[PDB]
Symmetry: D2
Subunit: 313 residues, 4 copies
């Protein structure tokens, strides 16, 4: 049972979708990711969501030593909840058993747990960006035209066990209705321990879109398959749907995720200068609606997390 006026704001710092040449404010190096996470926390993000990128050229990497560095350095400066991706790399065809290695290495409090195999395509960005600092960038974007983001039921069974072994909470990423169905199945099969934490992700080419209809239907599907008393949820709107759909989520009693991982913009046609800028905006809206951002320790109590110092970094 949680307070009806406290909203968890998550800030997704860099991701794997956007590339350096798309915005000079996309955090690329590990130290940039660290500083932007700490700034996001100080702006009201009770949780930060972390991917690694190669410092030399910003290319996505699964390297757990880069994760280890980033997470340790954030923890030195902040009590923010550090949520680690196990999805990062998937758009480069990297399997779950390799993506998942960050969980036993770092034993984070919470990490992402993607709930189905899907197309996950950003090749259309090649129409929008013509020149790139690095050769890897347009190659990466093109290759997503034929790469499956793979998360089979066999993968998910093994992942559920890995999370339990390292006392890591799954944040169950759902990009379509079928993936909520997948979530219900794994829950009812005993693999996922309640209360579940779901995140609804809207606007991926290969997933569900960004209509108000889509958001409502996702949440109602979770209510009816899983049961309201058995889960909490957050939402991501891609790109310019970040603030409108995030606001919808809050109105519906959900939590919200913002961050340069999901959108490079602060307004129509205006690049966000930092993660903190989007966090400050969403906090202003949360407060107009008579709510407030959760502190990191509130996030821990709300999601039942193990504690900032019970991690392996």
């Amino acid at each position: 049972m949680r307070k009806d006026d406290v909203v968890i704001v998550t800030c997704a710092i860099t991701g794997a979708i956007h590339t350096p040449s798309m915005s000079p404010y996309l955090p690329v190096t590990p130290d940039q990711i660290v500083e932007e996470a700490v700034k996001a926390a100080e702006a009201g993000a009770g949780m930060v969501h972390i991917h690694a990128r190669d410092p030399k050229d910003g290319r996505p990497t699964t390297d757990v030593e880069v994760f280890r560095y980033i997470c340790r350095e954030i923890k030195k400066q902040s009590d923010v909840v550090i949520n680690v991706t196990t999805g990062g790399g998937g758009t480069l065809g990297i399997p779950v058993e390799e993506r998942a290695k960050v969980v036993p290495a770092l034993k984070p409090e919470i990490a992402t747990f993607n709930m189905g195999s899907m197309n996950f395509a950003i090749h259309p960005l090649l129409k929008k960006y013509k020149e790139f600092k690095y050769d890897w960038e347009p190659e990466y974007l093109e290759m997503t035209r034929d790469i499956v983001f793979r998360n089979t039921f066999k993968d998910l069974e093994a992942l559920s066990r890995i999370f339990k072994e390292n006392d890591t909470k799954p944040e169950l990423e759902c990009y379509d209705i079928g993936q909520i169905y997948n979530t219900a199945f794994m829950f009812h099969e005993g693999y996922l321990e309640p209360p579940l934490r779901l995140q609804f992700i809207h606007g991926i080419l290969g997933g569900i879109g960004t209509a108000v209809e889509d958001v409502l239907f996702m949440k109602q599907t979770a209510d009816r398959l899983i049961g309201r008393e058995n889960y909490t949820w957050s939402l991501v709107g891609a790109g310019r749907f970040q603030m409108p759909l995030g606001t919808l989520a809050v109105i519906m009693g959900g939590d919200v995720r913002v961050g340069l991982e999901d959108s490079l913009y602060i307004e129509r046609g205006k690049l966000a200068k930092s993660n903190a800028e989007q966090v400050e905006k969403m906090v202003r809206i949360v407060k107009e609606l008579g709510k407030r951002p959760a502190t990191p320790d509130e996030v821990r109590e709300i999601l039942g997390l193990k504690g900032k110092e019970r991690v392996n970094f």
Copy 2:
């Protein structure tokens, strides 16, 4: 008129295995006989997979397809809808599975609209004894096989279908795949009017709630346009007749068959594909409608004719 319903019958598929029902058609001759029976019962279109004649194992073998399609056409003017999905749950990619279309040049063929989990390993808790070793191996392997249909695959497939004058039947198992369909349509790969099929109840896809069906259809109206497509629905298993009837109430078309359910009623095996067709036709008729003849299927879906297929 809004009083004609296309009733499609999916004869064997690739999900059910022989040991699950002695009435699942296995051999090429069984599949032919059953298709022709389904047609005579009011299925204006039949949907065909191939199986290894020896043991029923799904196969892409084009020469089995050719034999089956040739033999159906010799007995019936039924519209023959060929799979390019069969083999997908064994990890065979679109490039291989699509070769039936340039070979046979069918009037219509299936065209799966996204990559997904497609899992039937739970069937192992229901069936313990199998005539063939391949059957439980296959069920188990689906726990870890992606039914792969990437945007690259789909661009290639769109061209293959156009090059052979084969209409795509766009199989959508989830809301995301209707979004994928809208993308491919707007990009210019898929020619309108589109033919969609909503498939409910696959582990890895959307479920079988009335909510699910309505939302799929509303998503197509909203992204594609109510005028720019027609649609059919498949309800897996015991949801076959109720969801098929729902589709009819909603102005859609319906698909039945042993590919999709082994049963005629809770606990009772269907003895043929024709039995399920006869039932659905009775339901259609009580709702004031009638099944489409094959030639009405051709008119409604803009198909080339049986004279122009390569069998």
Copy 3:
């Protein structure tokens, strides 16, 4: 969940005699049609009274008494008495409710809000009427509220309890489900509730699949799936499609000449039984079966045929 309650609504107050020679008008016609409906598989029949002389709707509790007495002599069917009939003539709940103490039925209708309820467009479809009352009645629905205020509802809730009569809570709109939830949460309506969704009335919600799903979802969300069961009425040509929909969704269904005069497009239904026979064929194709009257009593927790006051 393989039993469906099929109700047959025998005559109502909306259709008038000159619209169809098959609409039951006299008390004896209504009785006989109710009995045939029951024999066709309707476990419950729904009754309105009409004037024997010209078929004008009437609330006369003594006409109700004759009709219900005579049905019960011939059949164990559950007899559902209207407390809505007369409402489209401007007659308020206080008068319409008098049937409940008079007859103490097992179940009676209980309408869940005030609304416009207009059938004046029927004057565009029928230009010749045997009786002067028919077109005057139709025209006056243009300016008559079907009145069921919260005061009315509170009084009615008590009247039903005093007579051990189960409410069948008639909802014609989403607002009326909200009213139901209110009356339930306030303590006036004893669960489990029986609701009926009425689709197609001008002044009410329409006949889209969307409308039906949204009504049922609204009740699930406000009242709770565990706290109610439901039936559906589709008006006119929507009778069979929406009824079939309701069965697919796990609801019960109501048919009858009260709700539609037709058996198919352009063809008058020759009797209530014709409609029940057809809905029963559909129910059976969907692997279900009609509830017998005693199954209806068990499902809805009804007091039994011997405990009524007729």
Copy 4:
């Protein structure tokens, strides 16, 4: 698709004077609050009249005349005049409509069905009233129909047209959207239509996100996306979240002490402007801005401030 019409409903007929010292009740109070709302970014203000001495709701056209004249002297704000006010005292449309011929406003409310409209539960929250009329009024609404029959609406449509006043079509339920669809198709209502969805009245549709979306979808499906525009009213604590939802969905929004006495839970709004300022802040965070009164006129096709009869 970046301009949002923010309407402020200054006083209404639901809340009573003793519920908040900040509810405007005298004519001059109403004028002053209307101007402050306009200055805060309300391009339109919605006006009811109240008795100058006891604050009771009143239809008196000469009170409306003074109020609207005095507002227009100070502000070019668009003045929306109620034809619903008095309905909860049982006053019928024919009487409530007289303000339209008298004042020929640019825009006026046009309520789209008969309904329960009950505020007796306010007696649980407010125990002391300065006037006897206040608790009496609230209790009586338990048993008063808010009457708006099809005959009424036919008459009202001619009145609006005769005075070159745009109908703002108030829908409190799904059936009322169906009613709007009918009156449109019958030729009574001139497109493009202006609808307003009212959420939270006891007797109407509630305040769920589901309710809002289903109202808007029904209007799209029945009337056509291109044939209407819409505004939304969330009652009470739902004012801001539902108004924000409306903005997200492309709709316009109404605030004001008519609909909520509060600026935040447990904190009384000290003025209409306080609610307007808040909504306007929310609009701007969502990358939009409030309409000026002249933009309201252009967006809705209003005749202009110089063409009213005050």
